[PDB]
Write an enzyme that holds these catalytic residues in place. Sequence first.
Site, PDB file in Angstrom:
ATOM      1  N   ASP A  91       5.553 -26.040  26.899  1.00 51.28           N
ATOM      2  CA  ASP A  91       5.249 -24.939  25.978  1.00 51.28           C
ATOM      3  C   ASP A  91       5.178 -25.308  24.529  1.00 51.28           C
ATOM      4  OD1 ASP A  91       4.248 -22.465  25.300  1.00 51.28           O
ATOM      5  OD2 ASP A  91       6.030 -21.347  26.105  1.00 51.28           O
ATOM      6  N   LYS A 108       3.668 -25.601  20.945  1.00 48.18           N
ATOM      7  CA  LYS A 108       2.938 -24.712  20.052  1.00 48.18           C
ATOM      8  C   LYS A 108       3.654 -24.729  18.724  1.00 48.18           C
ATOM      9  CE  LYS A 108       5.543 -21.007  22.335  1.00 48.18           C
ATOM     10  NZ  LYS A 108       5.604 -19.533  22.632  1.00 48.18           N
ATOM     11  N   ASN A 131       7.137 -23.604  18.305  1.00 50.01           N
ATOM     12  CA  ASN A 131       8.184 -24.442  18.870  1.00 50.01           C
ATOM     13  C   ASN A 131       8.259 -25.819  18.203  1.00 50.01           C
ATOM     14  OD1 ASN A 131       9.742 -22.967  20.664  1.00 50.01           O
ATOM     15  ND2 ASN A 131       8.152 -23.084  22.323  1.00 50.01           N
ATOM     16  N   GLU A 166      45.891 -47.034  13.235  1.00 47.55           N
ATOM     17  CA  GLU A 166      45.327 -48.119  14.037  1.00 47.55           C
ATOM     18  C   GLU A 166      43.794 -47.955  14.119  1.00 47.55           C
ATOM     19  OE1 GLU A 166      47.806 -47.349  17.415  1.00 47.55           O
ATOM     20  OE2 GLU A 166      49.464 -48.544  16.684  1.00 47.55           O
TER      21      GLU A 166
HETATM   22  C1  LIG Z   1      20.166 -25.138  25.437  1.00 42.95           C
HETATM   23  C2  LIG Z   1      20.246 -24.865  24.032  1.00 42.95           C
HETATM   24  O1  LIG Z   1      18.917 -24.735  23.505  1.00 42.95           O
HETATM   25  C3  LIG Z   1      18.795 -24.438  22.175  1.00 42.95           C
HETATM   26  C4  LIG Z   1      19.869 -24.273  21.298  1.00 42.95           C
HETATM   27  C5  LIG Z   1      19.649 -23.930  19.999  1.00 42.95           C
HETATM   28  C6  LIG Z   1      18.344 -23.702  19.528  1.00 42.95           C
HETATM   29  C7  LIG Z   1      18.085 -23.172  18.244  1.00 42.95           C
HETATM   30  C8  LIG Z   1      16.811 -22.855  17.851  1.00 42.95           C
HETATM   31  C9  LIG Z   1      16.501 -22.360  16.486  1.00 42.95           C
HETATM   32  C10 LIG Z   1      15.765 -21.186  16.407  1.00 42.95           C
HETATM   33  C11 LIG Z   1      15.110 -20.811  15.242  1.00 42.95           C
HETATM   34  C12 LIG Z   1      14.242 -19.588  15.246  1.00 42.95           C
HETATM   35  N1  LIG Z   1      13.260 -19.687  16.324  1.00 42.95           N
HETATM   36  C13 LIG Z   1      13.261 -18.516  17.203  1.00 42.95           C
HETATM   37  C14 LIG Z   1      12.486 -18.953  18.412  1.00 42.95           C
HETATM   38  N2  LIG Z   1      11.132 -19.318  17.970  1.00 42.95           N
HETATM   39  C15 LIG Z   1      11.174 -20.405  16.994  1.00 42.95           C
HETATM   40  C16 LIG Z   1      11.929 -19.928  15.801  1.00 42.95           C
HETATM   41  C17 LIG Z   1      15.216 -21.607  14.107  1.00 42.95           C
HETATM   42  C18 LIG Z   1      15.992 -22.757  14.135  1.00 42.95           C
HETATM   43  N3  LIG Z   1      16.324 -23.670  13.194  1.00 42.95           N
HETATM   44  N4  LIG Z   1      17.184 -24.607  13.683  1.00 42.95           N
HETATM   45  C19 LIG Z   1      17.383 -24.308  14.962  1.00 42.95           C
HETATM   46  N5  LIG Z   1      18.103 -25.084  15.773  1.00 42.95           N
HETATM   47  C20 LIG Z   1      16.654 -23.129  15.324  1.00 42.95           C
HETATM   48  C21 LIG Z   1      15.765 -23.073  18.743  1.00 42.95           C
HETATM   49  C22 LIG Z   1      15.972 -23.579  19.981  1.00 42.95           C
HETATM   50  C23 LIG Z   1      17.262 -23.894  20.419  1.00 42.95           C
HETATM   51  C24 LIG Z   1      17.519 -24.283  21.750  1.00 42.95           C
HETATM   52 CA   LIG Z   2      49.553 -47.772  18.872  1.00 49.72          CA
END
Ligand SMILES: CCOc1ccc2cc(-c3cc(CN4CCNCC4)cc4n[nH]c(N)c34)ccc2c1
Ligand SMILES: [Ca+2]
Length: 466
Positions: A141, A143, A146, A459
């Site tokens: 996916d 795009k 993402n 240590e």
């Molecule tokens: C199994 C765990 O999987 C994860 C965990 C945390 C995540 C956080 C985001 C996130 C999301 C967003 C906002 N987004 C919403 C979804 N469309 C893209 C924008 C901005 C971010 N900036 N820094 C980030 N990390 C953002 C996106 C995917 C993730 C997948």
């Molecule tokens: Ca020790």
Amino acid sequence: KLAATPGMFVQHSTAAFSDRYKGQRVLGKGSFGEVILCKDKVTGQEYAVKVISKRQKTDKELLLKEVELLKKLDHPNIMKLYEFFEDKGYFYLVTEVYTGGELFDEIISRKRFSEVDAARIIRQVLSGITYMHKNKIVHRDLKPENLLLENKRKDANIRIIDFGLSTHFESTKKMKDKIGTAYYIAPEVLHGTYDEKCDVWSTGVILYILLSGCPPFNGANEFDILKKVEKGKFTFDLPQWKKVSEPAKDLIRKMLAYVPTMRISARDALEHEWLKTTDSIDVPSLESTILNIRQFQGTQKLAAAALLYMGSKLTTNEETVELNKIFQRMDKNGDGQLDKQELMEGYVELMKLKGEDVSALDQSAIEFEVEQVLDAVDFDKNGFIEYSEFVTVAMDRKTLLSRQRLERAFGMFDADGSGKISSSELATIFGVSEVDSETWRRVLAEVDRNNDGEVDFEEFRQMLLK
Ligand SMILES: CCOc1ccc2cc(-c3cc(CN4CCNCC4)cc4n[nH]c(N)c34)ccc2c1
Ligand SMILES: [Ca+2]
Ligand SMILES: [Ca+2]
Ligand SMILES: [Ca+2]
Ligand SMILES: [Ca+2]
């Protein structure tokens, strides 16, 4: 050997998320829950958490897998995961934060992209997926929604996110599930028989958009678009294409080739002429970094874990901007790894810079010298130097070894809070039931000053500080 990898440091915590993090603001909202900017309550450092509300048993395993996949990925253009917390009602997936926002918003703002900018961006995206496909993982996916920019800088680095639709693929069988997004979906996915080259098509659509401002396959609504997509015909007939070079379009044609077997791979895409489109580094910083790598001597596993922990999880992007530049240029093929020859050419390229005569070089000597660096530095023993490995080893030890980073590493390791790291705690760090009597012996023999059978904070300090 117990293989040291960044991913082993991400474990199922059973401490309360609330005990260590506080929410700052919403970054995005999903069907699942929300993604929330949080701060470590003690260090004030900021992370992005993905919070998932529960509902029962089917949901979890499907997720555990998105996690496990993400642990194995250790690449400069792929999302970094720090840890994950589970609740009676919730899952929290803590991760680094990229504050530059979605490339989607950048495209709606900037409208069009320079050949330089687009090449850098697509090259990075392709490096991420080349790596993925090398690990038999397909994203599915891709795009602009993402793809996140690391920060608000002009030429910010890209991160691929959201591996929730991603999967393992085998070259034996083919995938059938329909997965993707309207504009960016490959025709074979609609057809029901696909492989990793669907990601190539997606990225091909992205490139077309970056350069021209419009999607190559369009229509009044989803179904219309999917019809257009499925027929696969696209045009460079719009006026804005006149001001793009032929080699860019050649790449696009190869990436949107209808027939999958005739479509270029991610790996081969990286080598296209156009993708080196560019327009330097201070010798002192390059020299220090090279000198640090040469001086890195291998060590007992406890130190290797500690250092890798600090380098892979506790350095920030802002700290590593210099390192990031050097790494990308030493990675001649862009594949997200430094291999033996790339290392050797780095040294040679430095020699040119220094006025040292090339012909003079003893090729065999250098080769042996490089083999031994790689041996020392290659923490997971996979024959190649990954980003995190590089940063750990190439950053000036006093900087990486800041007092905070040391102390936080030790705390992570001393899991029971006893003030002293036990062999079982070491096993825990590696993700293994127990540590080889021999490897634990190899540690104490060098570090255990009191001679009390464990490593306390002083240590630990000496151990790295030498
Ligand atoms: C199994 C765990 O999987 C994860 C965990 C945390 C995540 C956080 C985001 C996130 C999301 C967003 C906002 N987004 C919403 C979804 N469309 C893209 C924008 C901005 C971010 N900036 N820094 C980030 N990390 C953002 C996106 C995917 C993730 C997948
Ligand atoms: Ca020790
Ligand atoms: Ca490489
Ligand atoms: Ca390695
Ligand atoms: Ca302990």
